[PDB]
UniProtKB/Swiss-Prot annotation:
The lineage of its organism: Eukaryota, Metazoa, Chordata, Craniata, Vertebrata. This is Receptor-type tyrosine-protein phosphatase beta. Monomer. Interacts with TEK. Interacts via fibronectin type-III 17 domain with CDH5. Detected in a complex with CNTN1 and NRCAM. Interacts (phosphorylated form) with FYN and GRB2. Interacts with IGFBP2. Plays an important role in blood vessel remodeling and angiogenesis. Not necessary for the initial formation of blood vessels, but is essential for their maintenance and remodeling. Can induce dephosphorylation of TEK/TIE2, CDH5/VE-cadherin and KDR/VEGFR-2. Regulates angiopoietin-TIE2 signaling in endothelial cells. Acts as a negative regulator of TIE2, and controls TIE2 driven endothelial cell proliferation, which in turn affects blood vessel remodeling during embryonic development and determines blood vessel size during perinatal growth. Induction: Up-regulated by hypoxia. The chain holds residues 1676 to 1965 of 1997 of the full protein. Coiled coil: none annotated. It comes from the Eukaryota. Substrate binds at D190, C224, S225, A226, G227, V228, G229, R230, Q268.
Amino acid sequence: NRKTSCPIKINQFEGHFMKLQADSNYLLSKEYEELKDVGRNQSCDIALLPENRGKNRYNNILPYDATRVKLSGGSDYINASYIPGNNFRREYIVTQGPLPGTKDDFWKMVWEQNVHNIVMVTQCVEKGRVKCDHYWPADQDSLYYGDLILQMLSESVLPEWTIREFKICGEEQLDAHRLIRHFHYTVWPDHGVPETTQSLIQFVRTVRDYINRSPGAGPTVVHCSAGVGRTGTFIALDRILQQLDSKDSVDIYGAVHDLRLHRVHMVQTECQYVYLHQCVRDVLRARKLR
Ligand SMILES: [Cl-]
Ligand SMILES: [Cl-]
């Protein structure tokens, strides 16, 4: 029944988005609402098993069975979902903020899934509430995490994000040792989206640049506290900005639709949906004049 895609010619985008926003977002809200049930036929039965409650930060925010990431061994559960790319599977892994009791699991998944890049879009504490464990080392002294050894090589604080590099080694499969880059966006507001489009556009472009210069990146891990709206907004913006560099139409609706198929709450508020439109708007406004 419902639309899976709403492509807009770039030359029409400014007017499209104005029309969507007219009459207090009348049409924007109607469009957003058409996405409401996408993916929602899918079960999370494994995530709900009695063994796994402690492994979920939030008991009501769970991976679908069909797209969950599995750990090797006798207890395969982690709160994490695969997101396919346009050209190949497993472009992204979306996950929750690791718990003290799941941080070893997190690094095991990183190792086993050949991940080279992690994007974190939450602070560890927000508004007095714990949102994520500090699941990486506090300094440059090496530490075991389960069967893995980790050592932080650098930690670089920038105005709106912090970039860390780690050495990691686990049981040898496709590699025997690895460098991990971690991109920590530190300024997402406590309720609402970033104040500027520029900030997240530049964060997404920076991460994408680092990924693209890797000889082999693996899936990119993206997490907030729950692996929900902020993470989905990040990934959607990555897709949308690449679209603007390749095609003469942009499909924000489709980008969000595609994410919702694979995990609950991928772009979770109308405000995030609006923000994605504002980002596209602003890029196109600039380009029109250059
Ligand atoms: Cl996939
Ligand atoms: Cl791809």
